[PDB]
Amino acid sequence: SLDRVDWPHATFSTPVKRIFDTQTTLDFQSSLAIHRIKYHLHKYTTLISHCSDPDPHATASSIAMVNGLMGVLDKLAHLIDETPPLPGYGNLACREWHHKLDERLPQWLQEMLPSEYHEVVPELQYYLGNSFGSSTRLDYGTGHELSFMATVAALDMLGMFPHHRGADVFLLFNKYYTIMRRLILTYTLEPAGLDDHFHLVYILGSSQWQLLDAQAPLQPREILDKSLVREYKDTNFYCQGINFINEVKMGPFEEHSPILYDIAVTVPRWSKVCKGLLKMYSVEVEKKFPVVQHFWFGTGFFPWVNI
Helix, strand or coil: CCCCCCCCCCCCCCCECCCCCHHHHHHHHHEHHHHHHHHHHHHHHHHHCCCCCCCCCCCCCCCHHHHHHHHHHHHHHHCCCCCCCCCCCCCCHHHHHHHHHHHHHHHHHHHHCCHHHHHHHHHHHHHHHCCCCCCCCCEECHHHHHHHHHHHHHHHHCCCCCCCCHHHHHHHHHHHHHHHHHHHHHCCCEECCCCCCCCHHHHHHHHHCCCCHHHCCCCHHHHHCHHHHHHCCCCCHHHHHHHHHHHHCCCCHHHHCHHHHHHHCCCCCHHHHHHHHHHHHHHHHHCCHHHHCCCCECCCCCCCCEC
16 A cells, blocks of 8 residues: 555665666656655645645644654754764764664564564664764755655554644754754755756745735745745745745855746646656655665555555
8 A cells, every 4th residue: 555554564664775786766756655645745745735724833733753853853953962063065974873873773663563573673663763864974955855754654654643644744844944954053064956956845835825825925936035935934835945045055046046046937827836846856856866875665654565
């Protein structure tokens, strides 16, 4: 099935590398793995379009395992000011951060999950542990972001998010993007293009407003305005991503983000931005060898099998 792991016929084991060449990039195109990723990408995008207006002060969901996952993310957050910038390209305190992360994270995910599900930790630990960038190269891109979506897809396949709402994906991904921005700045990470680091923010941000399109607080062309974008950054992912680019990049916008600029200037409806960016996702991340290279496969969540 695409939406559930067949519990408990299923077996979980340490994720392993599979994509290494061209033929293997297309084997991927017809694997249970890619179809599970795609199913969840579409589910989250759809769920979040019902949430044009999340509460920016919300701390909690009434879904237990969203709270659970927030906590593990909170624990990783405080891990940073225990691992302060060395000087220096990516900074090297990051290696230490990742090492502290890799040490404590299986413990954390055991605390987070009920007893029944503990065998799942080797696979979840890999997926969550690869969401925050590369230890050796010290960079962050769309493959790490994918692996944070892989993480939540995997909890979802275990039936941990029943009646998952748009507001629960905003909350989860919102905590996640606040940590990422925090990292990038603190440990000066390198770009691993639409955006130097991200691709889902914009699928999700444009989907938040795709159902209201004409009465959206902002139209696509309005994103070129720096201060309108400030006012909506807490409540809309698209603004949040563009507002980060404004703060970390110093050319005029057309110069440093030509692809986002060419979309703002040319796509008049949010439902169109979303679907365009979705199709780009298949090509610029799912069919891109330098990205999907480092997505590893286990036997339970995202298996290397046909059909």
